[PDB]
Paper text:
Kvs 10–12 have three intracellular domains: an N-terminal Per-ARNT-Sim domain (PAS), a C-terminal C-linker domain, and a C-terminal cyclic nucleotide binding homology domain (CNBHD).
Therefore, we determined the Cryo-EM structure of Eag1 Δ3–13 in the presence of calcium and bound to CaM (Eag1 Δ3–13/CaM) (c and Figure 6—figure supplements 1, 2, 3 and 4). Two different conformations were identified for Eag1 Δ3–13/CaM: conformation 1 at 3.7 Å and conformation 2 at 4.0 Å resolution. In both conformations, the S4 helices adopt a depolarized conformation and intracellular domains are rotated in a counterclockwise direction when viewed from the extracellular side of the membrane, but in conformation two the extent of the rotation is larger (2.4° degrees for conformation 1 and 8.6° degrees for conformation 2). The rotation observed in these conformations is in a similar direction as the intracellular domains in the open conformation structure of hErg. However, the extent of the rotation of the Eag1 intracellular domains is not as large as the 20° rotation observed in hErg and the S6 helices remain closed. As a result, we believe that conformation 1 and conformation 2 represent pre-open conformations of Eag1 on the pathway from closed to fully open. A hypothesis for why the pore remains closed in the structure of Eag1 Δ3–13/CaM is that, compared to hErg, Eag1 might be more stable in a closed conformation. Rotation of the intracellular domains observed in the different conformations of Eag1 Δ3–13/CaM occurs with CaM bound to the channel in the same orientation as observed in the WT structure.
Author numbering:
A (entry chain C), B (entry chain A): 14 to 201, 214 to 242, 247 to 273, 284 to 304, 324 to 406, 412 to 696, 706 to 720
């Protein structure tokens, strides 16, 4: 987007300016702000289309040497600055400081001119053609140079030598504005995706490995642990730096920085469990995707399984040796587990029982039985704190199983509604056709039409899709849709592009099935048709009169006739035909609007077949009958009727 | 579909041709391609409706003997070929090679003629009526025969005797084109279903029997196994051959052939598990059907049960004797199973325990407890690898149970939405009628109307179904719907079929409940009605004036009157009445368009009851009162009003 005006008016700070066209003779004004309207005393429409030299603002005391200096700076495309007595709408002699900056382009062309203004009346000299008094003209000069003296020469009324300080500072403000004349009238991440992916898999790593290291407590795991720490710190500084600079840093310190700092800095290793705060960055990224939330629920299901498995082992380990009496108590899932798999605990000391890998996967098996509502009961809780933990994990497993089932059911509901609406409309059409006892050929024809247009369109109301778009986008879409007419016919290559869009907005598109007829003989012809694909036959009295191929126009010339006629012939299709039709009313609307186009349209459009003009012909069977009639070789009430035919 | 033009233009290869009507006198042209338009120098509309003898193309030097030869070949319907000097639009003497082929039919009738052309100017002789020079006319002859000499006589400029080689080859190309004149202007599997069914049940067989033969390891099973192999190979060659010949074979080798070849060719019997790649052929075939996907999920549920049951037995068998120390380890579901059912393992050697049928069905019971989330725990895992397998199968069973529950819920949601929309609109209608305190008779009448039209229509917006169809199909559907008028009335049997469709598109259809009145006395009559079923009464002043049966027309004649009138009588229905009404505006539109029909319509349509013309009558109670009035046996302000009635 090109915010060429907004940057100038933001930098300007109550100073005023006009914009003129640098590439047009006499340099006409294309824009003037309200400050220039107030200082000039003119209105926007009255300012624009005048010269940006502001020759209408000149006067008898306006120096012509400054005028040709302005002309030279406009011709040479040169940043300059001048002061000149110019007049207003009330013809007051007002000295102006015009600063002219050419405007380059992305193509570096000198396309515009910027002329900024101020009032230098009080700064130089008061000169009046007539005034009430010297104080009155002086007061008018001070009131005119109000925003010059006021909001720029603030402390300058205390000091002397304002021409040496404050006027030079206003000229330097115009110089910094010329430094800000850079917008030049032109329009002015995958690393984040890959970074969020690798920190997501590392958050899965730490959510597996931290409760593992809490409960069950090499070297290369410590190496990759330090890699996890430094990559997390790089992610913190990237969450500082990257887009949504200092305002997003303050927003990050408000939002998430305390958790993300304490997450990755000896019991406080459980504080590392808060590293899943990074996962909420990706959770919004794939909540729109639906089938991946099933994968999200399965992943958090396994993650919570690993979590509460380590919690379950922690409960067993807290329970076996909770006292200094060192009793096994004959009651724990660890003790029943050691009696189950073998090697019960022994003492010589207290020699441990089961191996830690078997312990972890046995505990994960137990937590999976809990969260999956299976519940075998090999490992099954019998101590107090493990039982209240069992209640807790069963209440969590119910909700996790519910969320999985609801997500799967919603996935199936979308995947089934998208086909069920089509199957239901097909079933209702079959029900309707069976209701009214359509002859089976026509029922099959309408049915295979419905299946064919549902295979082609895939269930898209394309006209409604065009209603979703705005006006110009829909018109340009229609122009691309009717490129198959407009690039092909000589009738349309002389049209204006506005006429192209105002035509293309009226063109329906027909997908004719083979064997299906468009205009039956006797139907109203009200829409000339262009054939962009397929092959057509024209049947007059059971006889093929015209074969229409690609790029042919039939129907009836409306703009010459202005008369509705009957189709003198059937028009049937031979192949899958693509037609681009236009009714006569919209055609006549466009042709009445585009008057200079319509004559060239009449001269260029040659109908391949008039569907009004019945063509006279005889069959060869008829002249065979006439040749047979050599073997054969009152009229007064009827021949007068033939004389009425003579009167006809 | 009849692609009569497309085959000719595909075979033609830059040669040009016209198509003329063989059954019409003077043999008029029905088609000419752009090559003929370029060679002739004429436009498509200017070519067509001229003779296919191209008599307009003839000249002073055109041989009349060739003209009558062309006439004889057209009359006798004979494939021939000629060369003749003919003229163009700029009247240039151009020698043509016309090749004429009659076009047969599916009915073998000589319906069209094909006349193909080329330029034989340079090949025979240059003859000009006038030219600039001999080289100029020679250059025009070479430029005219450009596509003849260029893209056909390619290497012939190197050789001599072009009349003996290249011109004969172009005539032979026309001969092969006459061999390709076969399209003749005419339109040009259950074994796959049964084959996919029997390979589907065989894929169920191999998916049951291969893990059975992997884990648990007669003769007739080997016989039917070899039948499975040979039927699978026949399916491979049918997937090569059958529709979607060589392109589908290359697409099959890209798509599925490697898997389907390695699937059916001693440990690589597990490779036979990939035979389920055939099932993806049927999975797309019944994904549209919805209730069968429940059967699909139950079948893959039992199939995965059998799979992981064999995997479970494999885990037990791998676990009992994993070492050469030959320890039972007192820990396996096989060992606990043998201690459960009886016969523990013994040695004398190692005598086995449980019987293999009991082992398989016990393992299948266990896998069903896992996948059904029941989890009794007779068989319940206690070794390491069986526990991580238990985690795996519980994570699979959760998703399988979720998919089953989601599919069942979607099935119930479709089966319930289809009745819930009707029950909800009925509840809202009852709520609305109870809201405004309708007298209970009228509420019951509207309610039983709604239930009656929902029993009859079964919830089908039949007008919207007509909007789904295209124009001609909707018109033909409407013609079949109003066959009950058009086959019955003498008013419509003189109509054009275009008038039939343009009328039938305007006919509403009313299902009058008995006791319900159409036109109340005083309502506007604007729609003449045809009664195709039922019985009606016409009430004027509480007295039945006309009983209307099947095939009667009431309303008002609009086209004579062109005046809107009031209904002078109530028109009530006696039975379930089927009416086909048409408003006066669409009727007047059609009758204004079909002018020659409207007179016969006026002559033939006799109204069974004018609803405008009030009929004068007296009641017998009134004349009984008048006979009573014999016992009974100022006017000037009122009788003058009666004189005003005389003025009326």
């Amino acid at each position: 987007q090109n915010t060429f005006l907004e940057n100038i008016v933001r930098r300007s700070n109550d100073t005023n300016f006009v914009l003129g066209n640098a590439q047009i003779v006499d340099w006409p004004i294309v824009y003037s702000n309200d400050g220039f309207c107030k200082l000039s005393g003119y209105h926007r429409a009255e300012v624009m289309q005048k010269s940006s030299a502001c020759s209408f603002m000149y006067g008898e005391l306006t120096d012509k040497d400054t005028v040709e200096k302005v002309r030279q700076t406009f011709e040479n495309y040169e940043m300059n600055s001048f002061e000149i007595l110019m007049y207003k709408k009330n013809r007051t002699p007002v000295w102006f400081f015009v600063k002219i900056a050419p405007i380059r382009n992305e193509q570096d062309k000198v396309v515009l001119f910027l002329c900024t203004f101020s009032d230098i009346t009080a700064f130089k000299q008061p000169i009046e053609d007539d005034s009430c008094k010297g104080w009155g003209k002086f007061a008018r000069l001070t009131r005119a140079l109000t925003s010059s003296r006021g909001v720029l020469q603030q402390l300058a009324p205390s000091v002397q030598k304002g021409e040496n300080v404050h006027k030079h500072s206003r000229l330097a403000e115009v110089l910094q504005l010329g430094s800000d004349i850079l917008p030049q009238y032109k329009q002015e991440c995958v690393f984040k995706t890959t970074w969020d992916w690798i920190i997501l898999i590392l958050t899965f790593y730490t959510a597996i490995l931290v409760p593992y290291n809490v409960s069950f407590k090499n070297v290369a795991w410590l190496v990759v642990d330090s890699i996890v720490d430094v990559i997390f710190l790089v992610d913190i500084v990237l969450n500082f730096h990257t887009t949504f600079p200092k305002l997003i840093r303050m927003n990050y310190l408000k939002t998430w920085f305390v958790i993300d700092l304490l997450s990755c800095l000896s019991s406080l290793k459980v504080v590392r469990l808060l590293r899943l705060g990074r996962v909420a960055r990706k959770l919004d990224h794939y909540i729109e995707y639906g089938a991946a939330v099933l994968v999200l629920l399965v992943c958090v299901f396994g993650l919570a399984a690993h979590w509460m498995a380590c919690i379950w082992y922690s409960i067993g380990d807290y329970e076996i040796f909770d006292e200094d009496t060192k009793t096994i108590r004959n009651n724990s899932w660890l003790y029943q587990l050691a009696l189950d798999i073998g090697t019960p605990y022994q003492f010589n000391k207290w020699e441990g029982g089961p191996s830690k890998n078997s312990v972890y996967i046995s505990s994960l098996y137990f937590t999976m039985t809990s969260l999956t509502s299976v519940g075998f009961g090999n490992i099954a809780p019998s101590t107090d704190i493990e039982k209240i933990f069992a209640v807790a994990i069963m209440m969590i497993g119910s909700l996790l199983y519910a969320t999985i089932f609801g997500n799967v059911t919603t996935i199936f509901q979308q995947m089934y509604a998208n086909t069920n609406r089509y199957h239901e409309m097909l079933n209702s059409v079959r029900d309707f056709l069976k209701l009214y006892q359509v002859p089976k050929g026509l029922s099959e024809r309408v049915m295979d039409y419905i299946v064919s247009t549902w295979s082609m369109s895939r269930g898209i109301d394309t006209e409604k899709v065009l209603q979703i778009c705005p006006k110009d986008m829909r018109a340009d879409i229609c122009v691309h849709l009717n490129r198959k007419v407009f690039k092909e016919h000589p009738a349309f290559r002389l049209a204006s592009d506005g006429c192209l869009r105002a035509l293309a907005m009226e063109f329906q598109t027909v997908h004719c099935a083979p064997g299906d007829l468009i205009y039956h003989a006797g139907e109203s012809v009200d829409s000339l048709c262009f054939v962009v694909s397929g092959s057509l036959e024209v049947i007059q009295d059971d006889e093929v009169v015209a074969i229409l191929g690609k790029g042919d126009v039939f129907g009836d010339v409306f703009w010459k006739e202005a008369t509705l006629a009957q189709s003198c012939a059937n028009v049937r299709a031979l192949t899958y035909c693509d037609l681009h039709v236009i009714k006569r009313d919209a055609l006549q609307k466009v042709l009445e609007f585009y008057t200079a186009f319509s004559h060239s349209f009449s001269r260029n459009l040659i109908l391949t077949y008039n569907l009004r003009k019945r063509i006279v012909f005889r069959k060869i069977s008829d002249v065979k009958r006439e040749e047979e009639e050599r073997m054969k070789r009152p009229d007064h009430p009827v021949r007068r009727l033939f004389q009425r035919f003579r009167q006809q």
